[PDB]
């Protein structure tokens, strides 16, 4: 019953429609992202890995309304606990599996951070987060296989905060692209 993009290109085209206004239906975007069947023939040009850390690969600049990117998680790669700078954030599995750990926000006092939820994102599953949902850390479940995910942020942002799990203290971090439109950007 959901509009089903047959190709990554269809998906991008639909996303341009859904983010053209000032209202974004979160469940609708989520269902449409989820309905696209990951096809590595279509996104291999973006799947540029690094040995030591996950990479961010810009697919589409969404006419300033959103950023669409592909994250490549090597064996055992994972993120810090982080926020998402007041944007809508969608993340869809394209290959492998990611564990998402949702964390509560620290307050002023120093303290071990508190897990609110833990799950594995299944094949083609699209999850959603924003700052009001919580913080999270995302990581490849596998030490023998990669994971690949498709992330949509609206509006785009390129800074966020990383949090120390032991204290809740945070650091601003500039986020960078490993590649854009399939072209390395070193
Ligand atoms: Fe995130």
From Swiss-Prot:
A Pfam family: CDO_I
Binding site for Fe cation: 82, 84, 136
Enzymatic class: oxidoreductase
Cofactor dependence: Fe(2+); Ni(2+); Zn(2+)
Induction: In hepatoblastoma Hep-G2 cells, down-regulated by phorbol 12-myristate 13-acetate (PMA).
Example of a GO biological process term: response to glucocorticoid
Outcome after substituting residue 89 to S: Reduces enzyme activity and iron incorporation by 50%. Zinc incorporation increased by 20%
Protein name: Cysteine dioxygenase type 1
Lineage start: Eukaryota, Metazoa, Chordata, Craniata, Vertebrata
């Amino acid at each position: 019953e959901v509009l089903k993009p047959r190709t990554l290109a269809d998906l991008i085209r639909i996303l341009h429609q859904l983010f053209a206004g000032d209202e974004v239906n979160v469940e609708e975007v989520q269902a449409i992202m989820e309905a696209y069947e990951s096809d590595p023939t279509e996104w291999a040009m973006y799947a540029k890995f690094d040995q030591y850390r996950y990479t961010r690969n810009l697919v589409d600049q969404g006419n300033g309304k959103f950023n669409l990117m592909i994250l490549c998680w090597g064996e055992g790669h994972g993120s810090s606990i982080h926020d998402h700078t007041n944007s809508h954030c969608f993340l869809k599995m394209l290959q492998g599996n990611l564990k998402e750990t949702l964390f509560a926000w620290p307050d002023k006092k120093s303290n071990e951070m508190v897990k609110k939820s833990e799950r594995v994102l299944r094949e083609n599953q699209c999850a959603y987060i924003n700052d009001s949902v919580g913080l999270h850390r995302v990581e490849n479940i596998s030490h023998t296989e990669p994971a690949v995910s498709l992330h949509l942020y609206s509006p785009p942002f390129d800074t966020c905060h990383a949090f120390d799990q032991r204290t809740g203290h945070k650091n601003k971090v500039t986020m960078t692209f490993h590649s854009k439109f399939g072209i390395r950007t070193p």
